[PDB]
Design a protein around this ligand. Structure first.
Ligand SMILES: O=C(O)[C@@H]1C=[SH][C@H]2[C@@H]1C(O)(O)C2(Cl)Cl
Ligand SMILES: [Cl-]
Ligand SMILES: [Cl-]
Ligand SMILES: [Cl-]
Ligand SMILES: [Zn+2]
Ligand SMILES: [Zn+2]
Ligand SMILES: [Zn+2]
Length: 244
């Protein structure tokens, strides 16, 4: 059961006050939206650009009516920082690691038109170039992580080590037993390897086994239970082996 939104987003209820919003135009990217017991809404990751993000925020506004929104970037890629322009414009409080902010600014130095070449889809290319990704307004030291407390309901952000990217963090909701693992959760294949640390990935994923989690949410594709971590570890080990 899902609700269809503008620009090919879909919202699925996966629990009480917990939804996954998926951007099916841009690699089926997952965005977690969780309403805290005290009414604060927490958003993890983002759609790639301004139309998807505005659609997301409209739906959050209508269906949850929050007084406060906290948005947490999972890494510097567009499924991660692409929502910041609109989150900030809508009044949300945007957070990321210091390294994530740094890499986002670095990536922005690059020539967009030469960079966005690798879409081929003219409609998507125009949407991409009409957005201009910015870093979060608030930062924490990567290796220290960050803990939010919303009337004693906790949201924990931590760095398990480099894997999909040098800066990838996970977000854990203890009361709801929910882990958003993002793009280091890769149960079938590793995907985009450009910013990846394949050698370090198996131990980085092993660090996620400690979480008491009934649900694990990956950056792309269908979510699952704690077995998502086990599969990832095996996929990561296979790659290390093949490349020696
Ligand atoms: O490995 C991933 O996480 C993904 C594979 S395709 C897509 C996504 C991403 O890195 O955001 C691109 Cl390369 Cl745009
Ligand atoms: Cl800019
Ligand atoms: Cl803290
Ligand atoms: Cl308690
Ligand atoms: Zn549908
Ligand atoms: Zn990524
Ligand atoms: Zn991704």
């Amino acid at each position: 059961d899902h609700v269809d939104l503008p620009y090919n987003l879909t919202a699925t209820k996966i629990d009480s006050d917990v939804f996954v919003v998926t951007d099916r135009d841009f690699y089926s990217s997952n965005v977690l939206v969780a309403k805290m017991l005290d009414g604060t809404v927490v958003i993890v990751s983002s759609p790639f650009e301004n139309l998807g993000t505005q659609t997301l925020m409209d739906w959050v506004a209508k269906t949850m009516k929050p007084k406060k929104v906290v948005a947490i970037n999972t890494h510097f890629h567009l499924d991660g920082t692409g929502g910041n322009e609109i989150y900030k414009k809508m009044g949300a409080e945007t957070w990321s690691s210091d390294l994530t902010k740094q890499l986002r600014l670095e990536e922005n130095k690059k020539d967009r038109i030469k960079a966005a070449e690798f879409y081929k889809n003219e409609d998507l290319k125009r949407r991409i170039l009409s957005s201009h990704p910015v870093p979060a307004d608030n930062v924490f030291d990567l290796k220290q992580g960050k803990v939010f407390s919303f009337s004693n309901e906790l949201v924990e952000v931590s760095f398990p080590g480099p894997a999909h990217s040098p800066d990838n963090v996970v977000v854990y909701f203890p009361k709801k037993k929910l882990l958003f693992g993002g793009c280091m959760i890769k149960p079938k294949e590793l995907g985009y390897l450009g910013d990846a640390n394949v050698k370090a990935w198996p131990d980085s994923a092993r660090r996620l086994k400690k979480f008491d989690a009934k649900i694990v949410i990956p950056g792309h594709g269908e979510w699952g239970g704690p077995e998502m971590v086990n599969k990832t570890i095996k996929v990561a080990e296979k790659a290390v082996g093949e490349m020696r």
